[PDB]
Every structure is written in C-alpha cells, then in structure tokens.
Amino acid sequence: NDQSLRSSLLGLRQLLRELPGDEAPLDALAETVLALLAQYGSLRIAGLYRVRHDRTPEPQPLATLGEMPVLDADDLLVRTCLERGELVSVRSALQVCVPLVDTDGRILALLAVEQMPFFVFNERTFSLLAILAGHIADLLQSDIDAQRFSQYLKRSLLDARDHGLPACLYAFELTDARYGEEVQRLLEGSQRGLDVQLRLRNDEGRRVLLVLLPLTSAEGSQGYLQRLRILFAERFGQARELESLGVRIRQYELDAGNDRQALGHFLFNECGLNDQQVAV
Amino acid sequence: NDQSLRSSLLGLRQLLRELPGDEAPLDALAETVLALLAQYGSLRIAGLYRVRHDRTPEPQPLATLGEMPVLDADDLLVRTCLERGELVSVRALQVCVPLVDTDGRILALLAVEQMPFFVFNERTFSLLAILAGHIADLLQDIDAQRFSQYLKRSLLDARDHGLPACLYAFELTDARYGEEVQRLLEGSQRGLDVQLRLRNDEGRRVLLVLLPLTSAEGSQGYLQRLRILFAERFGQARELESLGVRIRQYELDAGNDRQALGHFLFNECGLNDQQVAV
Amino acid sequence: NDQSLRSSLLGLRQLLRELPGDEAPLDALAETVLALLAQYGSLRIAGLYRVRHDRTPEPQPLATLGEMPVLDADDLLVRTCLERGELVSVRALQVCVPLVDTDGRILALLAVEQMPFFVFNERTFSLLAILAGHIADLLQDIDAQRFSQYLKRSLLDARDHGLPACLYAFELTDARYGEEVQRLLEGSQRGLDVQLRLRNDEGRRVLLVLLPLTSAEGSQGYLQRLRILFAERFGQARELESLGVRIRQYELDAGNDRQALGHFLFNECGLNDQQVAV
Amino acid sequence: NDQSLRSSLLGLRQLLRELPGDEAPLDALAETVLALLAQYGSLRIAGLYRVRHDRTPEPQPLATLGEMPVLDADDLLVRTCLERGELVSVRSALQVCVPLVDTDGRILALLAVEQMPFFVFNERTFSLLAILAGHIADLLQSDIDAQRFSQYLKRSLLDARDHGLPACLYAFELTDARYGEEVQRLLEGSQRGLDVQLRLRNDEGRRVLLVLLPLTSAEGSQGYLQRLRILFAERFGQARELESLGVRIRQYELDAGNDRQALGHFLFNECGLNDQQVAV
C-alpha cells in the first residue's frame, strides 16, 4: 500500500538529524517544508510563514511557491486559522490556511495557500495537509518515556479523526515468565521506521510492550506482524510461534470511527494498564 | 535550499533497508513509488508497470492512480519510450516516463493518461525524470564501479536537468595522520552522499566524496559537519592542513566544459581510469 | 592484562606523529628508544647505533648508556647479529639486538656491554627483541601490503615470543547496511590495531581487524567498544546479525598448525593471496 | 634528549581513553601501572595495592611482580608512607614504598617494593618513581579552566623539587592588538603532547597565552620554541618573525633550585598576571 507519507516523514526526520546545530530548524528546512506541503497538496501558489508567540504571522515569508502575494494579516482565513489553531478553507484573498501545530497546541508556522486546483480542493486533501503539517511541527520541536509515548498517541488520535489517517496499537503481553525477558528482547529489536514502543507491567504483573504504528492501516499492520513472526522464527526456529512462548497479542486500530474513549477501554480494561501508566 | 527530493529519496532508502527480503523491492514499494511520481507531476490518471528484460512492459499494473485504462504495449508513446530509454511526451497517452538506472536497464514504466495543462511542460517532465532515475538506482573493483555509477547519475542530473552536485577530493599528505583523518572525513557522509577511497599516483590516500543534488554553496552544511567532527577529535584549534589534508572542490553543473571533470580527476588529483570513469 | 608494551609504543607513535618533519625519526628519538630498551633489559652499559644500507653499523652512537666503549664493527657478536638479522648473545659484548622491520631491513643496533645476571636469560632477550622489532616498524595494493606486514609482525611476536594477537574477520551480508556498518566497525579501532577493507569471492564486504599484543580474552574490551558504537547508532536493542554482520575470530598463538591461518583467510573467509599474504 | 617519561604517560593516557567505562581505571590498568613502575625502577619483586579512604592498604594486591610476599600492614615503611603521603625507603621487610598520590593529596594506591637492585636504589630513581606515581594518580582521577591549569602547575612544582624533573612555562604576550587574535590562534593550534595552555589578559589588557611544558628540560623547550617558529613561518612566511607581530616571549624554568616563591614573581610581576588568575 501507499506509504509515501511515512516515507516523507522518515526522510525529513533524517534531514533534521543531519542539520548543523547552528540555526533554527524551521529556518533551515523552510523551503523543504513548503515543497513537501506543495507536493502533498498539489499546490500552485503558497507561502510558509513563521508564527510568533502572540499567534500572529511574520509577513516576510520563510519560503514561497509561485507568484505569492504579500501576506495580509487581516485576511479572515489567516485570522480564523491562527485563532483556532486549525486548518481553515473557503470551502478572503486566500483559499486555505494550514497551521503547523505541535501536540502541546503551539503554532510554529503557517501555510497560506493562494491557489490550489479544484481536484485537490477537498476534505481528503485538507486532512492530508493537516496531518503532514502537525507531524512536521512535532519534528521541528524535537531535540521511551511514558510521557513522550502519550504524546505520540495524542498525535495519532489527531491524525485519526475525520478524513484522517488511522494508526495501529499493539500490546504484546508476556504471560510466560519463563520466556518473558527473551521475547521482550526480540520485540524491541524489531522497531523500524516510525514505530514507537513503551515497556510496562500490567495489572497481573506481566511485562507488556506497547507498540504504536503511526499512519498505518490494518493492511500495514498485518505486514508488521509478519515481519515480526519472521524475526521470531529467526531466533527461535520455525517450530515455535510467539503464542507458544506465552505472548498474547492485543490490537487496537485508531480510526475515524473511534477516539479517546475507546482507546482508554482498550488500554485500561483489555490490556490491564492504568491511567497513570499511559495518558489518554 | 529545497531538499524535498533528497528527503523523499532518503525516506525511500529507509523503507527499503527495512523491508523483509522476501518481496522484490519494486513490488513492495509500487504504490509508494507511484504516489511520489504522481505528486511531482500532479498526475490524475496514471499507471506504474514492470518492464521485462526485453524492454517490454508487463500488462498488469503494479499500481494505478485514477481510472487507468488497460495498457496497450503497442502504443506509440510506450514503444518510443522503451526504445529510447527516455521520457517521451506528445509534443492515447500524454507522457511516458521510464525508470532507468545508470546502466540503461529499464526497471519500470510510468504511463500517464492525464495530467493538467499547467504542469505539462519541460520543467515538470524534468522533475519526473530525475525522480524516476533516482528511484531506479535505489531499486537496482566493486566500490569504484559503484562510485562511477553514482557520478554518472549526477552528471545526468546536471546536464539533463540543471540540478547541481558537488565533488570533494581530499588528499592526505601526512602518513602519520592519514588513516585516522581519512576515517573522520568519511564520517561526514550525509544520507545520499557517496564516497570512494583511492591511492593517487604519488601513493597518497585520496577520498572522493560526491554530494548529489547539492550545490557548492549548499554543501557548506557538509563542510561544517566535517569541521565539527575534526574539532571533536583534535580540538577546535587544530587546522586540517596541519594534519596534511588538502581539499579540492569541483561543482557539477551543466556549465563546465566536457573535459574539465576528467582534467580535475586524472590530471589534478592524479587518478586513473581504472579508478574512476568519467 | 599487562599492556605496558602497547602503552610504550602508543606513546612513541604520538611522539612521532608530532615531531617536525625536518629530523629523521631515528635521530630525534634515539635517546628515548635507548631508554626504553634499557628499561626492558635493566641494561647498565649499552649503545644504540644506526645500521647502514649494507648492514654495517655507523661507529658514532646515536645514544649511549653508562661508560659505553667505542664500538668495534668487527666484533664477533656485532657481525653475527647483523649477518643473521637477529638477537645474539654470548650463550667483548654481552648481547646484540638489531632493530629490524618485517621486511628484514636493519634500521639500528643495540649493543649491550653490561646487564645483570638476573636478566641475562631468554625471557628477557625475548622482550628486548619484541620491543626492538615494534620500534623498527614505527620508524620505518599499498593498504593490503601494510596489513600483511603487520600480520607478519604479530606472527613473529606469537611464534618467536609467545605473545598473543587476535584477528577478527567481519563479513557484511546485507548490502543495505554494509557501507554504514563497515564504517562503524572501523571506528572500534584501538591505538595499535590495524585493519583492511576487502571484498571476498562472493562480492561481499569484509573487514579484517588485527589486534596486536592482544589475547582473544583481552580483546573483549575491543568488542565492547564495538557494541557500544553500534548501540549508539542503532539502539541497544538491535543485533549486529540483524544488520547482516557475521563475526569470525582467529587467535594468533604459537599453538595453531601452520596451515590454520591460511585456511581461515583463504578458505573460510573467501580471500586470496593478492589480498593477504600468510 | 630522553623523553621516555613523557612518552610513557602519553601512551598510558591513550590507554585510559580506550577503556570501556565499565570498571574503575585503577582496576583495569593495575598490571600496566605496576609494569610501568617496575620498568622505571628496574624492580624485581613488588606489589600494587589499593589504598582505602582510611589511608590503609587493601592487602590483596591489584597486581604483583616476582615472588611478592603477603603485604604486612604493620610494616614501618607501609605505615610511614601512608601516614605522610610520601615515598619512603630503608635508605622493615620491604625496601621502598611509593604512594600514588594526586595533587589534592588523595592516596589512590601503594607501590610496595620487596626487592630492587643496588644500582637503582638511590634518590634519582626514587624521584623518578615518585614522579611517575603522582602523574599516574592524576590520570586515574581524570574524567582550559584556570583552576585545572593551576593543578597542572602544582604537579610540575612537585616534579621539580629535590632529584626531581623540571618543567618549562611560556608566557606569550600579544602586545600588538592588530595581530593579536591571529597569533593567538596559531599558538593554541600548536599544542602537542602534554602541553597545557591557559588564555588570560595581563594588567595591560593584552592577550597572554600561558603554556606549561611538564617534564621538559631547557633543551626540550628550545625545541618547542623551534616547532613554533616553524609553524609561524608556515602561516606567515619566513619574512616575518613572531616578535614582529608583537609577540613577547617570556620563559620560566621550574627546577630544583626554585619553588612557588619564584613562580609567583614570574607570573605576577614579570607577566603582569595576578593571584586571582592563576593559583600558586
């Protein structure tokens, strides 16, 4: 399936890591950020603007696309976007404004779109742009904590709503104290891409590894479980399966149909975790 | 300073490194590869097709976008494309973009049935072809051969598309530091950078470092990283020249005369054509 | 676990790296070289002499310890020493120790007029010769040749003196990680360790790493450093085998049969005798 | 001249840097430390012992040489050595005891010598052993501060007394504000081996670089100044000398004849520094 989004973010994540510490990342990566948003939105004319502490934009663009006019801070789209911290569209001398907002609610920057074609001017594309902008904002703010894990969860919740993209959450319960340490080792070993992991003990005292796969469909997670069973068979041979080593696999999909209510049930009732271990 | 292409390729390289080795890369990444091309061309209807060893396309698509009609392998645009190993446009389909590596093997075919008028131009065709060519390379003396293939790619990017690359040649003249300094230099490598260790005709260590999709100016980040790594090992006070490091730079751009690069590598750096192909 | 010899050589290597290139190394370090030998033999009266291209010693000493008498080049101990290229003792002088590199070129001569009875034995002669041989090397395909010279040294240390060395062969089987992992492995190199990048007969990256004056057991520090560097890049969770790294170990000791090392390099590692000499 | 001592310490310094952080350095390098002391003292029978917080030795040796007898904590040499923190000799069932003592006065370890030959049983060799033991103790305690610099100075003072080895102290005064920044850059560049450097401003407001060459004779420093003039001619050509760029070279030798009294005069009166900049 189409993993261009994860791929784009992994690539950008690598770029950020290669940055010389001299210069704010928003400034260094401005043109790249705008280009990525333009690629995802099929944008024709747009600008990328720093947003100040007072939630107003700096009108001198960090980067522009096409013949972008001077930014008008009185524009209704600009004002509604920055006041509410949400994507806004005419669906104003602009067509859509997308804020780059981190999970703490802080607006780092603003994408103002002057022109984008009718065939991408819709809630599906708007959602993609919003997801990409929020994930970029998260990356810009970055330099196994339960605290951090909870933030990644929050982002995936934001991703999942509306025309938004789902995420998958695995809970590997190590019910057999004999093969517990071993199996946990295999599991952490298998992190790849954007996987995020957290080690906990459930209410039975058993080791539980939570694995969040952001921006991952059911099809994408089925594949994840298969890479896993592959590795399992690499250390332990084909004879034995994960389930034979006392591993209980629980799965929850973050999608449009559910939200924080169902996420808590899964974690606190099905997984035997508590509100103090993971913050929903 | 727009690094989106480099960033897209870096993401792809990571997806590749971390897939199970049971599925051929083209097949596992098809939908992803088509999505990326579609973004670069604002494509609306298109298909991605495997090309066989004999420059014929398999009929059944690896991925499609929009209501893509059945591919007609006898299509004028298709045949001319696969015959030339090059992007062809109508200046039934609108554009064909082959995915061809630096050796000329066609891995796949992008068949475009519909894209908007406002992107139906050479600047856009250029981008599609560059992206296609770098994807093909990702999907495809061993070390010297690899380096020369990548060098060839950057020569294409530059002459065919006006996209820059930067080549550094580091000569290490002090045998007392050469080994260690060489390894430090190598540690400066960014994601898509490629490098080659050599001995020149004076017996000296030479490191060639190619920065694709990078201008002489935009390679200042690379150099800064390099000066940081050195300063960590030897202190911020010690100069690279005191360690016997000579630095030479060569920017790849459509501008150079066609003998310059050969002059730089063979005549200035004292290398030969069993070490690097130009 | 006594690393004093390695530490003495490391200090010498640094003195060398940081002298101005106007003075020949033997001459600038003479007093230092004699002091070190004198320590290893509890020498009381001795001289250090340059040996000419024709295996004759220059009469005037580079350095002396105690009331060293004029050197008689016709001295039985001197001639036999320089003729053999080996340490000779009286079992006018007591011991002659040549400084000879792995190619058999005699750089210098240690002439001992007096040392105590309690150190006049093979165990001591052994140490003097090992020290002398490693100093000579410091004072003296280019990379493959260098590596094979060092390999030869460690074979001498082991067979002539019962001093251990350890050889690791790392084969990188996953092309997706090979380049990066190779560089990480190379970063594990300690002061006097020597290493060589190769491609085996299956086309795979191979890193050979020699740890002189190091036992299989005492090479655990090296491995630990290696596992720390990997854990920094890939996390403490990721296994080297998951990155396609195969590790083989070969301990150099007087014990192996004389065909083992050749079997290990050529037959097990798939290398050839243009890549490594055994 | 004979730089075996500096060489030994540079080598040991490199060994310590190669150590995996897992294990106290005294424990990891014990055999090497004992071997180095044995090499410098021509020792025949000896042991290396940890010294505890209470200034008593742990009788189980970290390392031994020859047929070393059990350590007797009642031995007069052992007791006098540890009580005074100084080398002691019969010049007791032992012949000499050398404490490994850092500049803060802390005894890390003890070298007990059962047998060493008459031809090294003398104050010259005793001094060498003491210097080596103190320098090793300093290295064991290590993980441009004026505070650190002052410690290095103190060690060289300790080194210089009695049958001890001298050190040289350079003070490069940059009298010409035109070529000041440039020349200072060259000077810091030239640190090699055990050089220790400190940047200060003197009482005229001029940049002054202090350079301490530990365990360095006058002959050894003459060579240092020549490496320097060589580098100077590398950046600035042969035409101009250091002195033409406003560099005033002051020199003081730490030797047996002087001590802290003369060191202060040089620093505070000839160099125009003060007691607050460097602590003598």
Ligand SMILES: [Mg+2]
């Ligand atoms: Mg993109």
Ligand SMILES: [Mg+2]
């Ligand atoms: Mg107004």
Ligand SMILES: [Mg+2]
């Ligand atoms: Mg409008």
Ligand SMILES: [Mg+2]
């Ligand atoms: Mg619980």
Ligand SMILES: [Mg+2]
């Ligand atoms: Mg659901």
Ligand SMILES: [Mg+2]
């Ligand atoms: Mg770029």
Ligand SMILES: [Mg+2]
């Ligand atoms: Mg990508």
Ligand SMILES: [Mg+2]
């Ligand atoms: Mg396959």
Ligand SMILES: [Mg+2]
């Ligand atoms: Mg096909």
Ligand SMILES: [Mg+2]
């Ligand atoms: Mg499809």
Ligand SMILES: [Mg+2]
């Ligand atoms: Mg190397």
Ligand SMILES: [Mg+2]
């Ligand atoms: Mg590099």
Ligand SMILES: [Mg+2]
């Ligand atoms: Mg790197």
Ligand SMILES: [Mg+2]
């Ligand atoms: Mg570019």
Ligand SMILES: [Mg+2]
């Ligand atoms: Mg770049």
Ligand SMILES: [Mg+2]
């Ligand atoms: Mg950069």
